[PDB]
Design a protein around this ligand. Structure first.
Ligand SMILES: Nc1ncnc2c1ncn2[C@@H]1O[C@H](COP(=O)(O)OP(=O)(O)OP(O)(O)=S)[C@@H](O)[C@H]1O
Ligand SMILES: Nc1ncnc2c1ncn2[C@@H]1O[C@H](COP(=O)(O)OP(=O)(O)OP(O)(O)=S)[C@@H](O)[C@H]1O
Ligand SMILES: Nc1ncnc2c1ncn2[C@@H]1O[C@H](COP(=O)(O)OP(=O)(O)OP(O)(O)=S)[C@@H](O)[C@H]1O
Ligand SMILES: Nc1ncnc2c1ncn2[C@@H]1O[C@H](COP(=O)(O)OP(=O)(O)OP(O)(O)=S)[C@@H](O)[C@H]1O
Ligand SMILES: Nc1ncnc2c1ncn2[C@@H]1O[C@H](COP(=O)(O)OP(=O)(O)OP(O)(O)=S)[C@@H](O)[C@H]1O
Ligand SMILES: Nc1ncnc2c1ncn2[C@@H]1O[C@H](COP(=O)(O)OP(=O)(O)O)[C@@H](O)[C@H]1O
Lengths: 615, 200, 239, 198, 85
């Protein structure tokens, strides 16, 4: 009678239909029924990596027992789920748990071959009762050998060689049933049967296109779990996305209302102007949308394959939408928009814009990095400027990329600072400097500065990165560089030719490494015309830096071409101009400013006095 | 008489205004809520680098619950702040942590759905074993206790992620650092209490 | 043999009808075992050290299911000390771990790729093996194979599968594309290099078609249901 | 002014963490102009090599300089016994009132190629790992020091590849992966090339 | 009031006259009072060599309280010495 008090039941809960319908997996149910009817030692252990369905199999067996596809031996058995957790409730005396478990075993034995026990997560049955001296968990050990209790269990694969293989007298008493995960085509069949329980809990409608999308779209992106269920959660979270909008009123409008309320708060607290404008603008927008809303009303209720993509975009934030109206105007105005920071070198900006546009269009290959290439030329041209320029509109940031340098790697053994240390050695919890920093938010751009100065041993670690985008650290976690962007910089062949530098690449490298790369983009020198448009940007940039004390400048054309005509080196590139500006302006304004008389406010002109320039 | 001698109540703590008036973070609230109201496996974890406001998100959620702005199936959910650091208090025995935890789980699942939980620093959900901290694993993958947590990022890849049967139960709301101008908006939001406590 | 030939596409193809998967093999990589102490990540630590209840990365992946084909990629770049670990794998069938539980490689398939020589016909590329591998490691192996280059007759048909594969990538958008025979015989003319194999052709396919298809696909005016043709405007591949 | 102001915030962020920034409140600016002729009271000689050093400190504390560069990277050379180290130590005297804030590291130690790792550390799995590096742990505390690279000719051409990325970025990494930032330090590296020519 | 038979008190004893001379060290008290009146962080720890008189610092703080020199926003506090054995 203690089974009423210590155990649950899974057959009474099966006659009420309060379990989920179990679809597929005929072979494992047949294997469990095959094992669970032999003469002695009839008790299986379901083993598999977590997620594959091991609790689903036992509930499907309960469904079959109530249904009647069972053999004639297993008729009317009434699976009872024990608890080795809730049976050590109050047992601080030296004999209570022992007789309690003995009373449960005599209650099972006192019923003539009916009860199928079910102990879930049986790796915690070994050290159940600690008597200071092993005397608990080896009370069922003489009983399983004759096979009087049937004992269905389900333990994780890597929880099995930690507790049971440690204590291997018991491991022979159990038969093992391995469970592997299905493929995509069976997940498509599973998801169409669970589209009967999420329509009731959430009163919505679900398109089959969402199922055939999410069964495949989460086979590339969320590469951290296993898949009978990693496609279920996207469906349920998209249903909640829809239910949040079927209730009282939509979303953006909510976004804008909260935002303008915030800016209102801030502004009134300050009473900054500024925000005053951005308020008004945001009030225009929120007005327009509102009207549009009404209009529409005057004139959807189901989920589709776009909401699945938006949910996957909202988590492991790789953008994966249809590219609907948000960035297509920026994706077309992208080559010339990137030309507000890089002057000239059109053939490289085109080859970067191409590799971004074909990635977001969804034309490229699911197992290769989205773009991994190496541009090189002379010094002071803008090869680090371009890599910091395209990390500015993917993110609206400047520092989310992972910039490492290979000028530290002048020796053979330093490779281990980016791959972790093997087990048994000092830094083992720390992992790798690289691999522990890309597994979080896998969309950042990666640079490898100065590939020349590295010793020829780090070249053979990137050799598997560029083609099959996996990498393995010290633990064993396969990180994926599937949809990052890899950029190599160099300095080979500063003034030779367009083919003397191309014969210089092949000397230091091998054919196995040049073949992995995309187009090796040669950078040219500069032009005296194209230098002029550099100078303006310099005189914009410092022109913002003095805005904090609200000084600015009124610079005329003769000074602005005087800066261009001097400091023109075809060798050193556009780097001496950033010294010439602060020699001509910075020391003069430093002497004049901090002795008073250049008060915040009045902007001072500059003009040339025949050699130099003065205020 | 079980969950009133161990765990406090943030909702009763917000009936007067004894919190901090959070400003901003729209996507984090609008992600935490529409994970907290699904059917199965419905417990988020606020993973963030330390010192970014992972507690102020939950307090803002509490104020949004009390002021009546949340969606329909969250009417007055009365979120509770458990603390497992005070439940391993009196125990030099066998089986004393088990009953003390079981009374709390039974008083949560014994009522209806109004015991949305909150454990801060759930990296210490693993310890105090001896097999313990393991009555909760069948409970989490059935959607009963809603268990909103928040841990630092370095502890999470040191304790929990080794034990992937656990971290298959939690979702991951990620919280990143703000920019400069939005921090200025935060600071102009909090120009209320610092001028009252210090009278300048 | 040389590069860009098919020495990994072969080993990912006999794991495709024995299993009907492509992830069901143990693809570990010996491009990272540059030093003498990277042996320990696949055999475990001796008992008493930090990671002891973790097992090997090799021993605790065959002991689960002892049937999967296993590769070893770029056997040059490993230090000449992992070869002596791989030695008793062959010709005995077992190794041990920290716990001493032996695992059995009786019925796997070990496949060893390489990039040796790159320019000997058959004599010199087999004369470069003997300087690097000892006479007790060549002796353990089966047929040491040599891969030939690529005839220009072969490189035609490759293009077929390439375009066929691209067709099965464009089924979600329901966009079908019609390739003419002049555009199909044009790619083998432009993309033949007897040094780099057939990998530079798979940049030529995405520079010919992909550069302008990615622009036409997201600017509007091309939608599902189209049979987009490619035909040789006298140099490029105009749509 | 009886309430708080943005000059008390300067004192809070200045006394704590040890960076003398602000807006040049009065008391040091009169000393800041009397600095070239002040430096000519230990460094005698060198009329035209003091003003370039003056036009780094007065250019940097005046708030007109790039936020991502060190505030000085100049190098100087010539004959021996002219007082290079003496000028560097007088410069360290002027803005610390001390002598041990300067971080002198040798360059006559580095003839061998493997001896570079004193100023980086060791990768994870090697002998000195919990310690770190000389030149990194020296600057993780006291982040306002002047650093000295005495006689950088004797260093064979692979040490030059390390401090190549100290310059132009203002960052450095070590064994743990913690980027230390040299954004507000003086870098002075003395040489001995030439010695007789023009 | 029920723990004072199980704990101690150096506020009611601070008006007895059992307190030591507070000669010297009248800047660290200002540092501790500056730490103590904040919104966060208001739990200082005195870090130094043992056997110097950190206990005497806290006794001098209590002796300053019982006559009154800290501001009125920390007026009439009660300080409890804890029984660490
Ligand atoms: N073959 C299947 N048929 C029906 N439902 C399934 C199937 N596989 C998985 N599911 C459902 O998908 C989810 C998978 O979660 P579970 O299988 O219960 O987790 P589990 O199998 O217990 O693994 P762990 O390690 O115990 S968390 C549940 O909601 C199942 O009902
Ligand atoms: N075309 C250009 N457009 C804008 N800024 C430029 C251009 N060319 C040079 N510059 C500037 O000059 C510097 C060159 O940028 P970098 O790319 O960092 O130098 P580099 O080309 O990387 O050469 P190294 O060898 O890496 S120092 C930066 O400060 C740029 O702002
Ligand atoms: N958006 C915000 N609104 C109001 N206060 C905020 C906001 N963001 C941060 N804070 C304040 O910043 C501090 C951070 O508090 P916590 O959230 O507890 O810190 P944390 O992010 O949890 O990191 P730890 O683990 O607590 S050190 C508190 O004083 C908050 O009031
Ligand atoms: N003979 C071939 N038949 C079919 N596909 C081929 C052939 N040769 C090359 N390929 C394709 O070329 C691409 C790369 O070939 P891989 O075999 O991966 O390179 P590899 O032969 O392994 O040489 P390495 O040394 O590993 S770089 C894949 O898309 C292959 O399908
Ligand atoms: N311009 C000067 N004014 C005052 N004293 C000087 C001057 N130049 C040199 N001295 C003195 O001469 C000594 C050598 O000067 P330093 O500049 O320290 O030599 P140094 O820099 O070590 O030269 P090298 O090339 O590195 S061996 C110092 O101890 C100074 O006191
Ligand atoms: N300002 C002071 N006035 C009186 N006694 C002091 C003073 N400073 C230190 N002492 C002496 O030091 C002792 C207290 O030291 P304490 O702070 O307890 O050091 P610790 O905590 O390391 O034991 C007292 O017995 C006292 O005689």
């Amino acid at each position: 009678q203690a089974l009423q008090k210590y155990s649950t039941d899974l057959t009474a809960r099966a006659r009420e239909g309060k379990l989920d319908p179990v679809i597929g997996r005929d072979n494992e149910i047949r294997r469990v029924v095959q094992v669970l009817s032999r003469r002695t030692k009839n008790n299986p252990v379901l083993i598999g990596e977590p997620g594959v369905g091991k609790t689903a199999i036992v509930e499907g067996l309960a469904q079959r027992i109530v249904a009647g596809d069972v053999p004639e031996s297993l008729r009317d058995k009434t699976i009872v789920a024990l608890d080795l957790g809730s049976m050590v409730a109050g047992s601080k005396y030296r004999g209570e748990f022992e007789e309690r478990l003995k009373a449960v075993l005599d209650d099972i034995k006192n019923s003539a071959g009916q009860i199928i026990t079910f102990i879930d997560e049986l790796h915690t049955i070994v050290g159940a009762g600690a008597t200071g001296a092993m005397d608990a968990g080896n009370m069922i050990k003489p009983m399983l050998a004759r096979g009087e209790l049937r004992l269905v269990g389900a333990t994780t694969l890597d929880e099995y060689r930690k507790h049971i293989e440690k204590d291997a007298a018991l491991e022979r008493r159990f038969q093992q049933v391995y469970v592997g995960e299905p493929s995509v085509e069976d997940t498509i069949g599973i998801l169409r049967g669970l589209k009967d329980r999420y329509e009731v809990h959430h009163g919505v409608r679900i398109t089959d296109s969402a199922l055939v999308a999410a069964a495949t779209l989460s086979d590339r992106y969320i590469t951290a779990r296993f898949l009978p269920d990693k496609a279920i959660d996207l469906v349920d979270e998209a249903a909640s996305r829809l239910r949040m909008e079927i209730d009282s009123r939509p979303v953006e409008i909510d976004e804008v209302e909260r935002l303008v309320r915030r800016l209102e708060i801030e502004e009134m607290a300050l009473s900054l102007a500024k925000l005053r404008s951005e308020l008004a603008d945001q009030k225009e927008k929120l007005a327009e949308l509102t009207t549009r809303w009404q209009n529409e009303k005057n004139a959807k209720e189901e989920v589709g394959p776009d909401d699945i993509a938006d949910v996957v975009s909202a988590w492991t934030g790789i953008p994966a939408g249809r590219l609907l109206e948000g960035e297509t105007a920026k994706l077309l105005r992208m080559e010339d928009e990137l030309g507000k920071r890089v002057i000239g070198q059109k053939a490289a900006v085109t080859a970067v814009s191409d590799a971004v546009r074909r990635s977001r269009a969804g034309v490229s290959d699911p197992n290769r990095p989205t773009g991994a290439f190496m541009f090189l030329g002379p010094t002071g041209v803008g090869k680090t400027e371009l890599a910091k320029a395209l990390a500015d509109f993917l993110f609206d940031d400047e520092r989310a990329m992972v910039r490492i340098d290979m000028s530290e790697y002048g020796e053979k053994h330093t490779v281990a600072r980016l791959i972790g240390a093997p087990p048994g050695y000092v830094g083992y919890e720390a992992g790798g400097q690289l691999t522990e920093a890309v597994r979080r938010r896998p969309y950042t751009v990666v640079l490898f500065d100065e590939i020349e100065k590295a010793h020829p041993d780090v070249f053979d670690v990137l050799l598997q990165v560029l083609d099959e985008g996996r990498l393995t650290d010290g633990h064993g976690r396969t990180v994926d560089f599937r949809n990052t962007i890899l950029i190599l910089t160099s300095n080979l062949g500063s003034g030779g030719s367009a083919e003397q530098v191309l014969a210089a690449v092949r000397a230091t490298f091998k054919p196995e490494f040049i073949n992995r790369l995309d187009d090796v983009l040669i950078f040219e020198g500069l032009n005296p015309e194209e230098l002029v448009r550099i100078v303006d940007i310099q005189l914009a940039q410092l022109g913002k830096r003095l805005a904090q004390r609200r000084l600015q400048l009124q610079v005329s054309l003769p000074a602005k071409r005087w800066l261009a005509q001097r400091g023109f080196d075809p060798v050193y590139g556009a780097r001496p101009l950033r010294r010439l500006v602060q020699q001509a302006i910075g020391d003069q304004l430093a002497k004049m400013l901090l002795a008073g008389q250049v008060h915040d406010g009045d902007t001072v002109p500059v003009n040339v006095s025949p050699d130099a320039d003065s205020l």
